[PDB]
Design a protein around this ligand. Structure first.
Ligand SMILES: [Cl-]
Ligand SMILES: [Cl-]
Lengths: 30, 39, 30, 39
């Protein structure tokens, strides 16, 4: 089963994920 | 079928977390800065 | 413009997002 | 059109971050526990 998603919204979600990936590890690792 | 409302919900949640991450980052940089001043 | 996404994968992504939402704030806020 | 590879990429990234969050949580609970033993 597939659902439809706006490409721009998936690009935005990707941006948010990449931002947590880039800045969260340095905080958690000290 | 249209999952826009779910995805936009995830964008809002993750963007809130990212705002909190950057505020924590700036608070940690500030805390480390103040300890050099105290010591 | 829309793209297709597996419902199960969007449900999994939602689970991952809800888990960061539930456990990350307590760590960052002390 | 099929964005499965992108979404699965996000699942892998977020699940890696969630694993790191729980490991940090357990390390913080352990650190607080050891300070009660030291003090
Ligand atoms: Cl924002
Ligand atoms: Cl996992």
């Amino acid at each position: 089963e597939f659902v439809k998603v706006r490409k721009k919204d998936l690009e935005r979600l990707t941006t948010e994920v990449m931002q947590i990936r880039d800045f969260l590890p340095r905080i958690l690792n000290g | 079928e249209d999952a826009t409302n779910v995805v936009r919900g995830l964008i809002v949640e993750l963007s809130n977390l990212n705002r909190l991450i950057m505020g924590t980052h700036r608070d940690l940089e500030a805390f480390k800065r103040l300890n050099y001043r105290k010591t």
